[PDB]
Amino acid sequence: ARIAGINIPDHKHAVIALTSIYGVGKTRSKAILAAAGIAEDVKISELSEGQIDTLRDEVAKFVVEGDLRREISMSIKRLMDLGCYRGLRHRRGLPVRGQRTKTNARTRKGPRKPI
Amino acid sequence: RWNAVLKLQTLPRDSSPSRQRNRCRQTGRPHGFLRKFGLSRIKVREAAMRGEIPGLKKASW
Amino acid sequence: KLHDYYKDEVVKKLMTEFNYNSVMQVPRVEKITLNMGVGEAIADKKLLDNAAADLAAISGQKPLITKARKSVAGFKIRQGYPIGCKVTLRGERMWEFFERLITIAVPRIRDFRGLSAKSFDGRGNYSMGVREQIIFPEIDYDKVDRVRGLDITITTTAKSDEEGRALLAAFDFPFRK
Amino acid sequence: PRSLKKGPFIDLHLLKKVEKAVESGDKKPLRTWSRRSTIFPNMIGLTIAVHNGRQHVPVFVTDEMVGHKLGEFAPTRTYRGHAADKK
RNA sequence: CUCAUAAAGUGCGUCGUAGUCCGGAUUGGAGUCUGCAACUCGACUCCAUGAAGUCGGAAUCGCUAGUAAUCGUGGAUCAGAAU
């Protein structure tokens, strides 16, 4: 069934099925089933409507999806706008050398590539 | 450093004479010193290889 | 019902304190285009079935399959392939689905936020972002296989960012800053 | 790419006392001249003042800052930002 | 006295053929340890990510018995990159 943000674990145990989530893993898979009181050896197709309900609400309170990916993008954007080499490394569109990369470097690059 | 090496000061603070510690004479490291030589584990080795330490010799197998 | 007061009552009030102009231009009729989430890729010959078989329960009529104009371009496109499948029409229907959509069922999802980011910037067509699992007062709890998550659009002819979204927060909540 | 090998540099006149203050927590802002030194664990949480060449600027070291030199957080030149200089 | 738990093995339970509870590359975050000190140059632990790969075009290599093949363990060098 569907729990968090876009996830459809089908035909598998309650444990391994939840392991397919970007946020929770094995450690979290066991603790959640123990808190909601659910058999870990039961398939997702054998779970009742009441069991899944208590599973969604609890697993709900967690961090996942886009909102998290934007936090990552921002983290890479902050050191990118500054004078940090690591940020320039993320781009790697910078000079790898020791001569100039800005111009006159076609002897290694080859034909001019589109901007 | 120059501030931590207050050990050089013969007279300890409020603490009893027991306050006086050790500190290496060469590097000035308090971690692991060797009373006999007063040098740290790092300096005793460097001084050993150089041969500046009399009577000292590298043990062999 | 609660849909008439808007456009005769709450359209003059929102055009007096921060406008000072005529009575029209802000906001008419004209159909509202309802698009579909790219069916391509997903799977093979099907899904077009579980389509028009769900987009025929929320509203009336069925979607029409239409191809493109037979004219090859600089892209992998053959002659005679069904791409698009769009059907938008109105009259007086596109009014009720702005009531039973943003009143009940929400709040009543499972983990709704509340704070939305600045969708549009220099136009009118807002934007959106919804997930695959939704709880509607017009959909069965146990009998529908494969959850469907579709967006929500709105066409407007505004001129400034403000003097807008001041009519959206007049019924369709929430929206914190 | 940076360079280290295995000989990270930490001026002894800014690494031994910084450890002193560790006797019972940390100590108020300090001032070091050699920005060449690199930032490491112990220095976390403390406020070291780097010399730009004119004065000492307070640089609150953080775990995220660990690894970079003290000089990297002490700008040499001074640009006003001729404008509204917002954000 | 300790490093030690030997591993495969045995008993019981679990997983279904899909790039998968196959496979682990890469990368993000946190941390331990050695060392004066590991941002190009460490090893290791945990979480997250989880690629190529579904067995391979022309030639060519190793062996006749507890040996082949296969599995795990201790040691010399030694503070620490031995697959």
CSV table of N, CA, C and O (backbone and C1' of nucleotides) in Angstrom, one decimal, chain E residues 35-66:
chain,number,residue,atom,x,y,z
E,35,G,P,49.8,5.9,18.1
E,35,G,O5',50.4,7.0,17.2
E,35,G,C5',51.5,6.6,16.3
E,35,G,C4',51.6,7.6,15.2
E,35,G,C3',51.8,9.0,15.6
E,35,G,O3',53.2,9.4,15.7
E,35,G,C1',50.0,8.9,14.0
E,36,C,P,53.7,10.3,16.9
E,36,C,O5',52.9,11.7,16.7
E,36,C,C5',52.5,12.4,17.9
E,36,C,C4',52.3,13.9,17.4
E,36,C,C3',51.3,14.1,16.3
E,36,C,O3',50.0,14.1,16.8
E,36,C,C1',53.2,15.5,16.1
E,37,A,P,48.9,13.1,16.1
E,37,A,O5',48.3,13.9,14.8
E,37,A,C5',47.8,15.2,15.0
E,37,A,C4',48.3,16.1,13.9
E,37,A,C3',47.9,15.7,12.5
E,37,A,O3',46.6,16.3,12.1
E,37,A,C1',50.2,16.2,12.6
E,38,A,P,45.4,15.3,11.7
E,38,A,O5',45.6,15.1,10.1
E,38,A,C5',44.5,14.8,9.2
E,38,A,C4',45.0,14.1,8.0
E,38,A,C3',43.9,13.6,7.1
E,38,A,O3',43.6,14.5,6.1
E,38,A,C1',45.6,11.9,7.4
E,39,C,P,42.1,15.3,6.2
E,39,C,O5',42.0,16.1,4.8
E,39,C,C5',40.8,16.1,4.1
E,39,C,C4',41.0,17.0,2.8
E,39,C,C3',42.1,16.7,1.9
E,39,C,O3',41.7,15.7,1.0
E,39,C,C1',41.9,19.1,2.2
E,40,U,P,42.8,14.6,0.6
E,40,U,O5',43.5,15.1,-0.8
E,40,U,C5',42.7,15.1,-2.0
E,40,U,C4',43.6,15.1,-3.2
E,40,U,C3',44.5,13.9,-3.3
E,40,U,O3',43.9,12.8,-3.9
E,40,U,C1',45.8,15.9,-3.7
E,41,C,P,44.5,11.3,-3.8
E,41,C,O5',44.7,11.1,-2.3
E,41,C,C5',44.5,9.7,-1.7
E,41,C,C4',45.3,9.6,-0.5
E,41,C,C3',45.1,10.6,0.6
E,41,C,O3',44.2,10.3,1.7
E,41,C,C1',47.5,10.2,0.2
E,42,G,P,42.9,9.5,1.3
E,42,G,O5',43.1,8.0,2.0
E,42,G,C5',44.3,7.3,1.6
E,42,G,C4',44.6,6.2,2.7
E,42,G,C3',43.4,5.3,3.1
E,42,G,O3',43.2,4.3,2.1
E,42,G,C1',44.5,6.0,5.0
E,43,A,P,41.8,3.5,2.0
E,43,A,O5',41.7,2.7,3.4
E,43,A,C5',42.5,1.5,3.6
E,43,A,C4',42.4,1.0,5.0
E,43,A,C3',40.9,0.8,5.4
E,43,A,O3',40.5,-0.5,5.0
E,43,A,C1',42.0,2.0,7.1
E,44,C,P,38.9,-0.8,4.8
E,44,C,O5',38.3,-0.6,6.3
E,44,C,C5',38.7,-1.5,7.3
E,44,C,C4',38.0,-1.0,8.6
E,44,C,C3',36.5,-0.7,8.6
E,44,C,O3',35.8,-2.0,8.7
E,44,C,C1',37.6,1.1,9.6
E,45,U,P,34.3,-2.1,8.2
E,45,U,O5',33.4,-1.3,9.3
E,45,U,C5',33.3,-1.8,10.6
E,45,U,C4',32.5,-0.8,11.5
E,45,U,C3',31.1,-0.4,10.9
E,45,U,O3',30.2,-1.4,11.1
E,45,U,C1',32.2,1.5,11.7
E,46,C,P,28.9,-1.6,10.1
E,46,C,O5',28.0,-0.4,10.4
E,46,C,C5',27.3,-0.2,11.6
E,46,C,C4',26.5,1.1,11.6
E,46,C,C3',25.7,1.3,10.3
E,46,C,O3',24.4,0.7,10.4
E,46,C,C1',26.9,3.3,10.9
E,47,C,P,23.6,0.4,9.0
E,47,C,O5',23.1,1.9,8.6
E,47,C,C5',22.1,2.6,9.5
E,47,C,C4',21.8,3.9,8.9
E,47,C,C3',21.5,4.0,7.4
E,47,C,O3',20.1,3.7,7.2
E,47,C,C1',23.1,5.7,7.9
E,48,A,P,19.6,3.1,5.8
E,48,A,O5',19.8,4.3,4.8
E,48,A,C5',19.1,5.5,4.9
E,48,A,C4',19.6,6.5,3.9
E,48,A,C3',19.7,6.0,2.5
E,48,A,O3',18.5,6.0,1.8
E,48,A,C1',21.6,7.2,3.1
E,49,U,P,18.3,5.0,0.5
E,49,U,O5',19.3,5.5,-0.5
E,49,U,C5',19.2,6.9,-1.0
E,49,U,C4',20.3,7.1,-2.0
E,49,U,C3',20.5,6.1,-3.1
E,49,U,O3',19.5,6.4,-4.2
E,49,U,C1',22.6,6.6,-2.2
E,50,G,P,18.7,5.2,-4.8
E,50,G,O5',19.8,4.3,-5.4
E,50,G,C5',20.9,4.8,-6.2
E,50,G,C4',22.0,3.8,-6.2
E,50,G,C3',21.8,2.4,-6.8
E,50,G,O3',21.9,2.5,-8.2
E,50,G,C1',23.1,2.3,-4.8
E,51,A,P,21.4,1.2,-9.1
E,51,A,O5',22.2,1.5,-10.4
E,51,A,C5',22.3,2.8,-11.0
E,51,A,C4',23.7,3.0,-11.6
E,51,A,C3',24.1,2.0,-12.6
E,51,A,O3',23.7,2.3,-13.9
E,51,A,C1',25.9,2.4,-11.0
E,52,A,P,23.2,1.1,-14.8
E,52,A,O5',24.5,0.3,-15.3
E,52,A,C5',25.4,1.0,-16.1
E,52,A,C4',26.7,0.2,-16.2
E,52,A,C3',26.5,-1.2,-16.6
E,52,A,O3',26.4,-1.4,-18.0
E,52,A,C1',28.0,-1.1,-14.8
E,53,G,P,25.4,-2.5,-18.7
E,53,G,O5',25.9,-3.9,-18.0
E,53,G,C5',27.3,-4.4,-18.2
E,53,G,C4',27.6,-5.5,-17.2
E,53,G,C3',26.6,-6.6,-17.2
E,53,G,O3',26.9,-7.6,-18.2
E,53,G,C1',27.1,-5.9,-15.0
E,54,U,P,25.8,-8.1,-19.2
E,54,U,O5',24.8,-8.9,-18.3
E,54,U,C5',25.3,-10.0,-17.5
E,54,U,C4',24.1,-11.0,-17.3
E,54,U,C3',23.4,-11.5,-18.5
E,54,U,O3',24.1,-12.6,-19.0
E,54,U,C1',21.8,-10.9,-16.8
E,55,C,P,24.2,-12.8,-20.6
E,55,C,O5',25.7,-13.4,-20.9
E,55,C,C5',26.8,-12.5,-20.9
E,55,C,C4',27.9,-13.1,-20.2
E,55,C,C3',28.3,-14.5,-20.6
E,55,C,O3',29.2,-14.5,-21.7
E,55,C,C1',28.4,-14.3,-18.2
E,56,G,P,29.3,-15.7,-22.7
E,56,G,O5',30.1,-15.1,-23.9
E,56,G,C5',29.6,-14.0,-24.7
E,56,G,C4',30.3,-12.7,-24.4
E,56,G,C3',31.8,-12.8,-24.6
E,56,G,O3',32.2,-12.5,-25.9
E,56,G,C1',31.3,-11.7,-22.5
E,57,G,P,32.8,-13.7,-26.8
E,57,G,O5',33.2,-13.0,-28.2
E,57,G,C5',32.3,-12.8,-29.3
E,57,G,C4',32.9,-12.0,-30.4
E,57,G,C3',34.3,-12.4,-30.8
E,57,G,O3',34.2,-13.4,-31.9
E,57,G,C1',34.4,-10.1,-30.4
E,58,A,P,35.1,-14.7,-31.8
E,58,A,O5',36.2,-14.5,-32.9
E,58,A,C5',37.5,-15.1,-32.8
E,58,A,C4',38.5,-14.2,-33.4
E,58,A,C3',40.0,-14.5,-33.1
E,58,A,O3',40.5,-15.4,-34.0
E,58,A,C1',39.6,-12.2,-32.7
E,59,A,P,41.2,-16.9,-33.5
E,59,A,O5',42.7,-16.5,-33.1
E,59,A,C5',43.5,-17.5,-32.3
E,59,A,C4',44.3,-16.8,-31.3
E,59,A,C3',44.9,-17.7,-30.2
E,59,A,O3',46.2,-18.1,-30.6
E,59,A,C1',43.7,-15.9,-29.1
E,60,U,P,46.7,-19.5,-30.0
E,60,U,O5',46.8,-19.3,-28.5
E,60,U,C5',47.7,-18.3,-27.9
E,60,U,C4',47.3,-18.1,-26.4
E,60,U,C3',47.5,-19.3,-25.5
E,60,U,O3',48.8,-19.4,-25.0
E,60,U,C1',45.4,-18.2,-25.2
E,61,C,P,49.3,-20.7,-24.2
E,61,C,O5',48.7,-20.6,-22.8
E,61,C,C5',49.2,-19.7,-21.8
E,61,C,C4',48.6,-19.9,-20.5
E,61,C,C3',48.8,-21.2,-19.8
E,61,C,O3',50.0,-21.3,-19.1
E,61,C,C1',46.5,-20.5,-19.6
E,62,G,P,50.5,-22.8,-18.5
E,62,G,O5',49.5,-23.1,-17.4
E,62,G,C5',49.6,-22.5,-16.1
E,62,G,C4',48.6,-23.1,-15.1
E,62,G,C3',48.8,-24.6,-14.9
E,62,G,O3',49.8,-24.8,-13.8
E,62,G,C1',46.5,-24.2,-15.3
E,63,C,P,50.6,-26.2,-13.8
E,63,C,O5',49.7,-27.2,-13.1
E,63,C,C5',49.9,-28.6,-13.1
E,63,C,C4',48.6,-29.4,-12.7
E,63,C,C3',48.6,-30.8,-13.1
E,63,C,O3',49.2,-31.6,-12.1
E,63,C,C1',46.6,-29.8,-13.8
E,64,U,P,50.2,-32.8,-12.4
E,64,U,O5',49.4,-34.1,-12.1
E,64,U,C5',48.3,-34.1,-11.3
E,64,U,C4',47.4,-35.3,-11.5
E,64,U,C3',48.0,-36.7,-11.3
E,64,U,O3',47.9,-37.1,-10.0
E,64,U,C1',46.8,-36.6,-13.4
E,65,A,P,49.2,-37.4,-9.1
E,65,A,O5',48.6,-37.8,-7.7
E,65,A,C5',48.4,-36.8,-6.6
E,65,A,C4',47.2,-37.2,-5.8
E,65,A,C3',47.1,-38.6,-5.2
E,65,A,O3',47.9,-38.7,-4.0
E,65,A,C1',45.0,-37.8,-6.0
E,66,G,P,47.1,-38.7,-2.6
E,66,G,O5',48.1,-37.9,-1.6
E,66,G,C5',47.5,-37.2,-0.5
E,66,G,C4',46.5,-36.2,-0.9
E,66,G,C3',46.1,-35.0,0.1
E,66,G,O3',47.2,-34.0,-0.1
E,66,G,C1',44.1,-36.0,-0.8
